[PDB]
DNA sequence: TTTTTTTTATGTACTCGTAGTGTCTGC
DNA sequence: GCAGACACTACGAGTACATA
């Protein structure tokens, strides 16, 4: 958690709406992961819950700010998946809803914030529906998603939406280079892979993701000219398998797009690699491999508890089958 | 820490120790929570216990040498060891090496202790509204409605009961959504208007507090804390927010149909009728004719039960069907000589009152149409 | 409820609801005559009004005047329903009381006579989330309830409902609201709230609501909170991510000509200007639809198609309808799969690559 | 006097008033006449075809005053309470409300006590497929060798949920869903007895709308009566159902197979003026295509409810190849798949029709 | 008058009145006639095949006044008494009702008392697979050192639900599901011992539809007599079974492979007269085609699950080339994929079957 | 010999251990 | 008067199982 400069306008606007008593109780943030998703929600919640003598800033002396910094306030509910789970169960939602009918202990307003509204199971969202539509007078909600459409349609209606604009790419590169010391092309590539959203591109360098990406690039450089797509299984099977699959998908998209001679490339840090991908693979084969990789990535994320070893191994075996001449490629279908 | 050297007479210890050990009990949520703190300052020993939403303080006087200090002991073990001792025997308690040695005659016992700083305290509130009332007064005030409050329900905060102070009168109400009980009575002091909800556990402890027709109890009411003083006994508890429905609207305003009966006769008739009623739906139906009340009860095994009682009634037949446990409880509580039933309609609720007193009233909703 | 729309603007009389002529007529005729029922089931998509019509029926049933078609208005046993100080009514959000134990508790408290009013009305909202055992528990009571109780059921969809529960209830299907009805209601609200509004921005809001009125109200509130506290065409256009230029048609032409570098530079420039991708795809489908319509008759040039007639005319002359249908199908599949993509931009890229490969 | 729901006012009160289900009625009446009374009956079948009503009628026949009579002799004393539902001995058990075994145990404890008034203490266990497994196992033995003065009537929708060891020791009567003609005739009787005017086409639409049930049909008829001014008229039924009668969609399919786009779009505009759901138009057209396929395969496949257009049906049955029918059906089925994702539902339906037109294998659009 | 149900009045009373299952009757006869009697017999079977009846017969034999014999006399006061419900030494425990250990203790403490009348106090615990874990522990403690005067008789439907330790101390007799011929023979005897006319084809249909259990056969016989006006005719039983048929899958796939359009239409109409989820019907039809294609590869593919429809299935496997089965599976799969979006589920499944029927023949 | 073992979100029962309450008696 | 003695009712947990 850290503050971002580009969050300052949105924050101000939204808080300016809240101070007048006109802001909607149910706010749905569209911020991309790594963007000012949690920082904005925390800032707004801290402003709302405690007193506001200083205006839109933080009055750290008041007991409300003290409880926020201690993280022990009773009227600041957080909906998060537990350590041992991934989705957000309906039991926590039901319990928080029952707790909401209780009047505020401190006599101030109430705030209920969900860490990520996409993680809700259908029952959880349905349970929230009634409280979102008709909440107690002291209550304000805050939702966080990457994709509003992935949410339940009825819940996506009751909650007023709000969008965070990704910063211009030059501004993003300027901000990233300040505290991250990498090459300009590598920095641009990391920014583009994260859909222009900082933090996530910063997260690629801060964590161990970048070394994994480089290992993946080396493995592709070894595999593509030989048609031996196996031995990629080691570079792909991981707790971040969707992210590395997305990296592979970006590489394939870059190859296919450069085949048409497009101006800009998603993967600029490794022009030789994408050039090799263009050389050794037919455009139809590249398109089929890209489609299959994206589909299996969606399979990995959607269904829960699926053994990834089997899925990535099957994907690689099917890719090796595709590279063989005289093989019918699949057709995208409804 | 220091060496206690507290010498306490058993007669001046057993009863206050039982008083302070009342609220605690069962398996606590966490350790230390089940414990009690004894603290001696300038010849006065205070026994304090808590549930972190309740507190008990008992003050006793000491004449023997000592030192000012506070120590914690497990409650049940100390209560059981102090009792059963020979009558008039002094108890000498002394702290060595993080343990408590208790001595009586040639009897020695060692108990594990905790630092006094590990015993939490409750909140503080000032400018509490003060009350001076007789013990048995508030005793029967709550007793008329102690059964009324619903236990373990989500609706409102029915796990408790409402005190309302208006003018010079204190009124107390409880309900469940099907039965409601009110009891209003003039105290004798200039009082403001207040409405508070005391929790069910606090109600039980308040009943446990009352003892003797001696020095009057002193209430200190607030918004989130309640206090009671009975002699050298001090009790504190935490209140409940929210508010009950308007009892005034609950009471029927058209008691057109009247019935006068004997308390004991009606109670015995209802007790007999309840035997053959449905085990879960303990409902009987009532036919009201001139100076006659007939009660009919059924159950899945049939076994129809009928009874007839002489009353003072004039009007038409109503055929009011309602639960038996409720009416049996209220008739148990009345202990009066005569009972007034008040009926409005075959769909309307019914009102139960003392014939010779208006201090307490009750209402019960019907069962089936 | 300070200034939140669609909460302080809940309908309170049958004359105030928007559309729903068939449902309102049926309910009014039932109330006026003796034709009353013990299980009404209002089903329809989001924000068409299920709960509101339910509450209006409840107010009409329990009014002091009696069984009346139009609710009275000023009275105690209607204002209590409006404020939620109700005792003859029972609102249960079934999505929270899914447990069969709570449903059996409800069935246990069905015989008790109401404190006031002639009917104890159980409004079970979000019915389809009840667990199966709870549904079977409600089945018998719905079949033959006591004469003094009536059930009202509202669900986003009846498919999840067990078919027996359907066979127990009177089904009223709230049809989605057309563009004109939504626009009229929003203009009426804004006139009654003295808020500056512009007809074009109102049309964009009505179009983006997708036939659900609560969405229209929420989008109006988003516009009000944005901009300068008033509904204006520029602010609504900016916030909705709508496109009002010929970028869509240029993209269609480039994709038809399969000009890869140009057709990708167009998407890159669109991302630079930040055009929302779902709207861009929707307009692409609209333009292809206008192509197909023109191929039957040039009068199906959409009005005068702004001022770019020639282009689509030219396009309508150069591409066989088979390739147009192929492009439409590919674009629609891409729109379906667009949410299930790492990010919308690259999903639109996938859709464009799929569309370009048909020898365009 | 008063206006109560048809689904509860017109519940059959004798074996004469139960329409259809000839096999179950015949078997029950014959067995009661012969005196052979099994001690466990299980009425299965789809919802609203009379299993609960038949079970209550069987209770009437068993407990009637004059003896074990197949036909309940009108209304006798022991039948009045059955009709009113307050009978001393007919124990209605909402099994879904008593799934716990600690309630079936209480049911079994008092089974031996003699009936208060009736000959048998008929235990009518509604929704027997909802009892918990422990309660099932509990009632196994009491079903195997019950006392001579108790009978069990179990009614459920799907027998497969029940353990097979319970299906073994009870008679299995299966109630088939009623035919369209049965529902239409019963509805004509009901609307005649209510002194309400009605239209034959309206009642045919009511019969078709309900899937072989009756209480569903009665509910939809009551909703129609609400929608009309107390009359069941064809326009009111068309409005409430959302259907296209049998003419407009046939005009659509005839124009579409004729490759005349102009009339197709003209009727699309008219249907928009009719204020009708677009997916309803698509589903009606798909159903018409399927009916064409059915009559092409099976020469005699049209029911009476389509006779008004039957002739035109045969025309398409003699003019269009089966392959073209399959092509149209699959094209419009993908159109249905894609419609919720088109920019506008009207726009999507126009695109689906134009797609069926462009890939017309006989008269495709010129290139 | 009082016509007792055929499921009760025809319960066997001697080992000679028990049909088939000789592998258990002979074993019990040899054990009783000789001295070797185990301390606890556990009877197993499937859905009314003769577990409780054989257990009751064993209890009758153990305590007969003539002595422990394979054939009880049937005349002494004990035989008459156990014949009816009332008897002291034989304790019939509905274990499925008294599952709690609290009720089990009140009856397992009686072992310490002497038998009142007979040699052995016999505990017939029916539906033993239902006891609670603690009750199972109590019964195991009893069985560990059982008194010489007590014999335990346990009857159940699913032996594997029992904990392994209790099963290790019981001699388990598994009762075979009755064959069609034995069913038909016993049904003919039952009908002829009473006044019910019949036709042999009707009894053959009853036996085949009884799924190898005498209770099912007798229940169906009573239903047929009721609907048959006191005579079991072939047409009556056939029509009743048609009202009761559930295997629409195999018949419908037979018709579809043989390409009888009218038969497919009639079977769809019949499956619509019965409330049937079309998705379930289609998916299990896919399963039947899957099993057929498997049997194409190896005769051992058809396991013991589908023994009731083995012959037909084997025939369908033998007479049809595998390529047609693969094509039928493909078209049925694609039809089920698009099924929910069709006009109606009935409508869509109908046209899916038409699509599958248009190929190969016609 | 040998060690080897898996999706989950949610709901529904059943059965035993143990606390909290009532009452009722010979204390 | 009073524990105390059951006697009973409720609740948690361990476990089984259903559905999707
Ligand atoms: N027909 C309508 N007329 C007026 N307002 C409507 C209508 N339908 C929906 N709304 C608005 O939507 C809000 C929620 O409506 P509601 O009736 O709860 O929809 P639902 O059917 O989905 O429960 C209402 O507060 C009202 O502002
Ligand atoms: N066979 C039938 N004959 C006449 N009416 C029927 C029949 N089946 C259903 N109904 C109508 O449906 C109403 C309820 O039927 P019911 O027997 O409860 O169906 P279920 O089998 O689902 O319980 C009856 O009051 C009756 O009007
Ligand atoms: N071997 C058999 N001989 C004769 N009848 C039998 C036999 N097995 C089952 N039956 C018939 O089935 C009825 C119930 O039999 P039962 O022995 O209770 O089966 P279960 O093994 O399931 O307890 C008996 O009344 C009898 O008619
Ligand atoms: F939001 Be509604 F109840 F579908
Ligand atoms: F009993 Be039925 F399903 F209405
Ligand atoms: F009585 Be058996 F086990 F069906
Ligand atoms: Mg709603
Ligand atoms: Mg029923
Ligand atoms: Mg048995
Ligand atoms: Zn602050
Ligand atoms: Zn009113
Ligand atoms: Zn009669
Ligand atoms: Zn003998």
């Amino acid at each position: 958690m850290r503050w971002y400069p580009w969050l300052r306008p949105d924050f101000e606007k939204l808080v300016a709406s809240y101070q007048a008593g006109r802001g909607h109780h149910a706010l749905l943030i569209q911020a991309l992961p790594g963007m000012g998703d949690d920082a904005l929600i925390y800032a707004l919640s801290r402003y709302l819950l405690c007193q506001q003598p200083q205006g839109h800033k933080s009055c750290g002396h008041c007991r409300g700010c003290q409880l926020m910094q201690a993280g022990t306030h009773p009227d600041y509910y957080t909906l998060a998946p537990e350590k041992g789970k991934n989705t957000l169960g309906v039991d926590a939602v039901r319990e928080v809803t029952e707790k909401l009918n209780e009047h505020a202990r401190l006599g101030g307003a109430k705030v209920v914030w969900v860490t990520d509204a996409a993680l809700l199971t259908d029952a959880a969202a349905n349970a929230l529906l009634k409280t979102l539509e008709e909440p107690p007078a002291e209550t304000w909600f805050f939702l966080a998603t990457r994709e509003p459409e992935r949410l339940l349609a009825t819940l996506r209606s009751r909650c007023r939406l709000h969008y965070l604009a990704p910063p211009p790419e030059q501004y993003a590169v300027t901000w990233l280079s300040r505290e991250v010391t990498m090459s300009q092309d590598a920095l641009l590539a990391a920014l583009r892979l994260s859909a222009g959203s900082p933090g996530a591109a910063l997260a690629l360098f801060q964590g161990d993701n970048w070394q994994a990406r480089e290992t993946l690039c080396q493995a592709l450089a070894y595999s593509v000219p030989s048609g031996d797509w196996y031995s990629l299984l080691a570079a792909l099977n991981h707790e971040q398998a969707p992210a590395r699959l997305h990296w592979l998908a970006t590489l394939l998209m870059d190859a296919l797009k450069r085949h048409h001679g497009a101006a800009q490339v998603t993967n600029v840090d490794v022009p030789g690699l994408v050039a090799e991908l263009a050389n050794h693979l037919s455009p139809s084969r590249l398109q089929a491999i890209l489609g299959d990789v994206c589909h299996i990535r969606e399979q990995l994320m959607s269904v829960t508890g699926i053994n990834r070893e089997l899925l990535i191994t099957d994907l690689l075996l099917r890719i090796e089958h595709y590279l063989q001449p005289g093989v019918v490629l699949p057709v995208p279908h409804l | 820490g220091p060496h206690m050297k507290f010498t306490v007479e058993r007669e001046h210890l057993l009863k206050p120790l039982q008083q302070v050990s009342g609220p605690l009990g069962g398996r606590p949520t966490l350790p230390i929570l089940g414990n009690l703190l004894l603290q001696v300052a300038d010849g006065t020993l205070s026994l304090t216990g808590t549930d972190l939403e309740m507190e008990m303080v008992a003050r006793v006087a000491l004449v023997q040498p000592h030192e000012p200090g506070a120590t914690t002991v497990p409650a049940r073990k100390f209560f059981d060891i102090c009792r059963g001792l020979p009558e008039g025997a002094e108890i000498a308690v002394q702290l060595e090496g993080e343990r408590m040695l208790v001595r009586s005659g040639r009897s020695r016992f060692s108990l594990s202790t905790l630092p006094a700083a590990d015993f939490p305290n409750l909140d503080d509130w000032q400018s509490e509204v003060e009350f001076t009332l007789p013990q048995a007064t508030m005793k029967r005030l709550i007793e008329a409605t102690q059964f009324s409050m619903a236990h373990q329900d989500v609706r409102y905060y029915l796990n408790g009961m409402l005190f309302e102070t208006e003018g010079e009168e204190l009124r107390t109400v409880a309900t469940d959504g099907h039965r409601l009980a009110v009891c209003s009575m003039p105290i004798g002091q200039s009082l403001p208007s207040h409405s508070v909800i005391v929790p069910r556990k606090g109600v039980i402890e308040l009943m446990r507090m009352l003892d003797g027709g001696d020095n009057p109890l002193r209430v200190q009411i607030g918004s989130n804390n309640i206090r009671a003083h009975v002699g050298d006994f001090i009790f504190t508890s935490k209140l409940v927010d929210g508010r009950f429905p308007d009892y005034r609207r609950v009471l029927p305003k058209n008691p057109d149909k009247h019935l006068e009966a004997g308390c004991d006769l009606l109670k015995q008739a209802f007790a007999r009728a309840a035997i053959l009623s449905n085990e879960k739906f303990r409902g009987v139906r009532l036919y009201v004719s001139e100076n006659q009340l007939k009660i009919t009860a059924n159950n899945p095994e049939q076994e129809e039960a009928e009874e007839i009682l002489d009353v003072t009634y004039s009007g038409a037949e109503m055929e009011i069907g309602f639960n038996v446990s409720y009416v049996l409880d209220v008739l148990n509580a009345l202990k009066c000589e005569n009972v007034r039933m008040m009926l409005t309609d075959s769909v309307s609720s019914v009102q139960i009152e003392d014939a010779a007193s208006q201090s307490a009233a009750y209402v019960v909703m019907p069962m089936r149409l | 409820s300070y200034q939140v729309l669609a909460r302080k603007w809940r309908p309170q009389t049958f004359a105030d609801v928007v559309g729903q002529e068939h449902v309102l007529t049926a309910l009014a005729n039932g109330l006026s005559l003796g034709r009353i029922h013990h299980a009404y089931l209002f089903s329809g998509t989001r924000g068409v009004g299920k709960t509101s019509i339910a509450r209006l029926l409840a107010k009409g049933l329990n009014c002091e005047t009696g069984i009346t078609a139009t609710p009275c208005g000023v009275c105690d046993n209607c204002r209590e329903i409006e404020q939620g100080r109700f005792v003859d009514l029972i609102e249960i959000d079934a999505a929270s009381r899914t447990k069969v134990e709570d449903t059996r508790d409800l069935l246990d408290n069905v015989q008790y006579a109401p404190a006031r009013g002639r009917f104890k009305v159980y409004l079970i909202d979000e019915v389809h989330m009840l667990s199966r055992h709870s549904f079977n528990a409600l089945l018998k009571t719905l079949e033959e309830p006591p004469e003094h109780v009536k059930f009202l059921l509202a669900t986003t969809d009846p498919q999840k409902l067990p078919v027996t529960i359907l066979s127990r209830c009177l089904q009223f299907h709230l049809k989605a609201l057309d563009v004109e009805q939504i626009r009229h209601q929003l203009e009426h609200i804004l006139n009654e709230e003295h808020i500056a509004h512009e007809p074009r921005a109102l049309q964009l809001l009505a179009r983006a609501a997708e036939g659900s009125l609560r969405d229209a109200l929420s989008l109006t509130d988003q516009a009000i909170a944005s901009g300068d506290g008033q509904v204006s065409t520029q602010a609504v256009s900016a916030m909705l991510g709508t496109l009002d230029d010929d970028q869509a048609l240029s993209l269609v032409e480039a994709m038809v000509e399969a000009n890869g570098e140009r057709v990708m530079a167009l998407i890159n420039e669109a991302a630079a200007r930040g055009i929302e991708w779902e709207a861009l795809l929707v307009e692409m489908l609209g333009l292809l639809h206008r192509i197909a319509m023109v191929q039957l008759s040039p009068a199906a040039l959409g009005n005068d198609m702004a001022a770019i007639e020639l282009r689509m005319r030219e396009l309508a002359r150069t591409i066989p309808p088979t390739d147009i249908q192929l492009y439409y199908q590919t674009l629609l599949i891409g729109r379906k799969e667009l949410p299930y993509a790492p990010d919308r931009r690259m999903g639109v890229e996938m859709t464009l690559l799929r569309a370009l490969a048909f020898h365009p």
Side-chain angles (χ1 to χ4, degrees), chain A residues 28-161:
Chain A
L28 189 153
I29 307 295
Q30 209 170 348
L32 298 173
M35 189 72 109
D37 188 324
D38 290 3
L40 190 150
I41 297 300
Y42 186 102
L44 275 296
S45 191
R46 194 222 40 75
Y47 161 80
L48 263 67
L49 168 52
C50 69
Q51 302 300 313
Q52 41 196 53
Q54 282 294 317
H56 303 288
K57 292 277 180 306
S58 177
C59 49
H61 56 88
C62 82
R63 81 153 301 151
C65 289
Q66 308 163 352
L67 290 177
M68 304 328 269
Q69 294 134 25
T72 43
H73 203 286
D75 284 326
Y76 168 74
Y77 305 102
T78 305
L79 266 295
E82 292 83 2
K83 194 203 181 273
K85 303 177 170 339
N86 203 336
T87 65
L88 166 65
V90 69
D91 289 329
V93 163
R94 201 197 318 282
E95 157 68 347
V96 164
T97 296
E98 302 294 353
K99 196 152 307 300
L100 261 186
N101 277 14
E102 309 175 359
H103 280 288
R105 281 75 178 272
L106 276 78
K110 282 176 275 187
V111 62
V112 175
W113 157 47
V114 304
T115 58
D116 184 323
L119 310 176
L120 270 75
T121 74
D122 49 26
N126 288 280
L128 286 175
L129 293 184
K130 183 41 160 41
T131 307
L132 272 295
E133 164 204 8
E134 293 276 30
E138 299 166 353
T139 61
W140 322 82
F141 281 74
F142 287 112
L143 303 178
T145 58
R146 192 179 73 67
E147 209 77 40
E149 268 71 2
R150 294 185 92 174
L151 302 178
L152 213 52
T154 179
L155 191 143
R156 199 269 311 291
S157 80
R158 290 176 177 79
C159 185
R160 164 202 157 186
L161 277 80

Side-chain angles (χ1 to χ4, degrees), chain A residues 21-22 24 94 126 133-135 146-147 153 157-158 160-161 195 246 257 260-261 264 287 297 334, chain C residues 2-4 7 10 46 95-96 129 214-215 222 225 261 268 336 341-344 349-350 354 356:
Chain A
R22 203 181 283 265
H24 207 272
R94 201 197 318 282
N126 288 280
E133 164 204 8
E134 293 276 30
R146 192 179 73 67
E147 209 77 40
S157 80
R158 290 176 177 79
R160 164 202 157 186
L161 277 80
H246 167 60
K257 204 185 295 180
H260 296 91
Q264 212 181 96
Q287 160 72 20
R297 173 181 178 278
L334 177 49
Chain C
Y2 303 100
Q3 196 42 88
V4 56
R7 186 186 181 183
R10 190 78 54 87
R46 59 198 213 282
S96 82
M129 312 301 318
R214 171 142 36 72
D215 278 335
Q222 206 182 304
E261 55 264 359
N268 266 340
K336 173 191 87 165
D343 50 344
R344 297 165 298 285
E349 293 186 15
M350 282 181 178
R354 282 184 185 156
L356 193 145

Side-chain angles (χ1 to χ4, degrees), chain B residues 18-296:
Chain B
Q18 205 279 330
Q19 296 297 111
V20 298
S21 178
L24 61 85
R27 274 173 321 249
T29 304
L30 73 165
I32 300 196
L33 178 63
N35 266 272
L36 61 83
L37 173 69
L38 73 164
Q39 40 199 3
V40 173
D42 70 2
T44 295
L45 160 61
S46 164
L47 277 296
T48 177
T50 186
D51 199 2
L52 273 296
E53 60 97 16
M54 297 168 67
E55 276 185 351
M56 291 322 280
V57 170
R59 308 276 188 178
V60 291
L62 295 176
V63 188
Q64 318 92 325
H66 64 274
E67 60 90 24
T71 54
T72 56
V73 173
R76 205 147 311 290
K77 293 181 181 180
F78 200 66
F79 171 50
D80 302 338
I81 194 65
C82 70
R83 79 192 279 101
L85 281 161
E87 291 69 58
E90 282 179 352
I91 298 164
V93 302
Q94 180 79 317
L95 192 76
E96 288 84 356
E98 197 256 335
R99 67 187 179 187
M100 175 46 60
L101 165 63
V102 305
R103 187 265 303 162
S104 179
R106 296 191 309 276
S107 300
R108 307 283 184 92
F109 313 92
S110 290
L111 296 88
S112 177
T113 58
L114 276 298
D118 293 332
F119 195 52
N121 295 326
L122 265 60
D123 56 356
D124 205 2
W125 182 257
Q126 288 73 239
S127 58
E128 271 166 334
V129 181
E130 192 173 3
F131 264 119
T132 298
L133 52 84
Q135 298 99 328
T137 297
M138 183 273 288
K139 178 149 52 59
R140 57 95 178 156
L141 178 72
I142 293 184
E143 174 190 350
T145 72
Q146 178 170 218
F147 53 81
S148 173
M149 83 207 66
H151 40 56
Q152 310 320 304
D153 191 55
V154 180
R155 288 187 66 257
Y156 290 97
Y157 293 100
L158 273 300
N159 304 54
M161 59 197 288
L162 188 148
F163 295 8
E164 186 189 2
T165 306
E166 70 291 345
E168 195 168 347
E169 179 151 62
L170 172 59
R171 167 197 296 289
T172 314
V173 63
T175 185
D176 66 349
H178 292 330
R179 76 170 187 277
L180 181 140
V182 296
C183 184
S184 54
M185 183 268 310
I187 305 309
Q189 189 163 59
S190 171
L191 310 167
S193 65
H194 275 85
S195 170
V196 67
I197 295 177
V198 58
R200 176 190 180 93
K201 311 279 213 60
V203 176
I204 303 300
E205 195 38 71
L206 196 53
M207 205 46 55
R208 193 150 310 142
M209 283 303 290
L210 297 167
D211 58 316
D214 60 337
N215 50 358
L217 173 147
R218 259 185 77 251
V219 165
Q220 291 192 291
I221 197 73
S223 168
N224 277 34
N225 68 319
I226 203 179
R227 195 161 299 169
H229 305 260
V230 175
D232 55 357
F233 298 166
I234 297 89
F235 150 72
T236 66
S237 163
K238 181 267 290 180
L239 277 296
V240 185
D241 56 358
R243 270 176 319 291
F244 291 100
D246 186 21
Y247 63 96
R248 306 184 191 200
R249 192 177 184 272
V250 181
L251 271 298
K253 317 304 292 304
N254 219 316
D256 45 31
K257 303 312 294 149
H258 275 317
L259 188 148
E260 282 87 348
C263 173
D264 291 312
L265 283 171
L266 193 63
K267 172 182 169 180
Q268 302 267 42
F270 267 111
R272 291 174 291 174
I275 296 169
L276 295 184
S277 72
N278 185 296
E279 324 279 5
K280 181 69 181 295
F281 280 27
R282 301 189 80 188
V284 291
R285 66 198 72 187
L286 275 67
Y287 303 73
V288 191
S289 297
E290 59 92 19
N291 292 336
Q292 165 176 284
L293 163 58
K294 184 173 80 173
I295 292 187
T296 301

Side-chain angles (χ1 to χ4, degrees), chain C residues 165-217:
Chain C
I165 291 295
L166 277 77
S167 65
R168 297 300 212 287
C169 303
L170 297 182
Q171 307 194 42
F172 290 125
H173 271 77
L174 304 190
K175 289 194 219 64
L177 277 301
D178 292 331
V179 181
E180 281 309 313
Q181 300 160 305
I182 298 175
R183 185 209 56 74
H184 183 73
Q185 168 74 355
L186 269 64
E187 193 164 3
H188 200 76
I189 298 301
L190 288 182
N191 291 319
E192 195 167 353
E193 297 217 11
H194 326 303
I195 299 299
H197 59 93
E198 195 271 332
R200 188 53 196 270
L202 187 59
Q203 181 82 0
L204 282 71
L205 286 171
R207 181 64 61 85
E210 303 205 80
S212 85
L213 194 55
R214 171 142 36 72
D215 278 335
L217 274 299

Side-chain angles (χ1 to χ4, degrees), chain A residues 177-188:
Chain A
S177 68
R178 171 191 295 177
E179 63 272 34
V180 178
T181 315
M182 320 297 317
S183 175
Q184 65 278 32
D185 59 356
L187 187 63
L188 274 157

